[PDB]
């Protein structure tokens, strides 16, 4: 009913996930089935492009990764993690992977196109979100992490840049680049500097509790308009993170400050989401008292913000980027390394 309804859902969810995890989907499209239109965002080893699928007429977002750049930066395993996990997951606030494939030069992950843009762009423009506004988004991330963590997954790159706003004003989490299935502890120094938990920085082993720290950082940034730990350079950021001292804006409610003290907690035996009651300590907190968790999951709550959408193919909610020719060699690059992709 209350706890039994969630348990039964998660048990069936793991069943579905494990089937796709053990036998991943492969080679479900090819490059010439799409017309490439515009870059939506650039990254270290490639870009995400708005594309139009010829036979259906549907728009998609095609993440293109240069294999040679992936190998050079030692990101083979992470890239294989990214695709294997994303093709296997199913949740209302996770972006859907529609197709995946590779050619001689690149790897391709074709997602549903989330036209509303990054939360990042809206957050910086508006300045900050009101507490109810921030709470609405936070609630979706809480449920998403409850889902992912139950599958033994850690997400590892929570930030407004990786959160997209859909046509209904809801969150679509993208970028599974550092997503990893792990039952023990892990050690990779990865993520985004402002969002890193102290245990990551201090080269301690870490677990799913780093995602709950990242939630603290996200909630703070959404409600304040700036991160709790910022500087000009990553090294200076890490120093502030490790010290742990957090200051709050004068407009932060007492409830919000209490939640954040429990999220941005150095002590693993004291950090919310990592205690006996797990995710329930966050869910039952006074700051989330007005949150109807089922209604959020069912997407029945009125969104505080609906992005402007000027039809199919509209990129108005995204920044412009420099376009570049997508080169495909006549020789296969890194064939063995990406066999399973």
């Amino acid at each position: 009913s209350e706890q039994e309804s969630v348990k039964e859902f998660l048990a069936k969810a793991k069943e579905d996930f494990l089937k796709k995890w053990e036998t991943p989907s492969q080679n479900t499209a090819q490059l010439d089935q799409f017309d490439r239109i515009k870059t939506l965002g650039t990254g270290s080893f490639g870009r995400v492009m708005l594309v139009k699928h010829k036979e259906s007429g549907n728009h998609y977002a095609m993440k293109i990764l240069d294999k040679q750049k992936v190998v050079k930066l030692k990101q083979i395993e992470h890239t294989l993690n990214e695709k294997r996990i994303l093709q296997a997951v199913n949740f209302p606030f996770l972006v859907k992977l529609e197709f995946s494939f590779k050619d001689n030069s690149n790897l391709y992950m074709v997602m549903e196109y989330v036209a509303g843009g990054e939360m990042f762009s809206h957050l910086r423009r508006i300045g900050r979100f009101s507490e109810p506004h921030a709470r609405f988004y936070a609630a979706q991330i809480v449920l998403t992490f409850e889902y992912l963590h139950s599958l033994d997954l850690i997400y590892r790159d929570l930030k407004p840049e990786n959160l997209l706003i859909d046509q209904q004003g809801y969150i679509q989490v993208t970028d599974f680049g550092f997503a990893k299935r792990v039952k023990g502890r892990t050690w990779t120094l990865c993520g985004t500097p402002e969002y890193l938990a102290p245990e990551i920085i201090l080269s301690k082993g870490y677990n799913k509790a780093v995602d709950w720290w990242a939630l603290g950082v996200l909630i703070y940034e959404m409600a304040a308009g700036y991160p709790p730990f910022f500087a000009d350079q990553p090294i200076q950021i890490y120093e502030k993170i490790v010290s742990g001292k957090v200051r709050f804006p004068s407009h932060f409610s007492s409830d919000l400050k209490d939640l954040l003290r429990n999220l941005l907690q150095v002590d693993l035996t004291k950090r919310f989401g990592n205690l006996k009651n797990g995710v329930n300590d966050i869910k039952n907190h006074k700051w989330f008292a007005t949150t109807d968790w089922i209604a959020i999951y069912q997407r029945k709550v009125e969104a505080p913000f609906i992005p402007k959408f000027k039809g199919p193919g509209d990129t108005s909610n995204f920044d412009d980027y420099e376009e570049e020719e997508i080169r495909v060699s006549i020789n296969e690059k890194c064939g063995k390394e990406f066999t399973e992709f």
Binding site: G41, F178, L189, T192
Partner: peptide, 20 residues
């Protein structure tokens, strides 16, 4: 203010992920 200090910093644009 903290806001002014943030806005004057070099990290107000899209932040790239780090590794490894």
């Amino acid at each position: 203010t903290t806001y002014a200090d943030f806005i004057a910093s070099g990290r107000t644009g899209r932040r790239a992920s780090i590794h490894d």
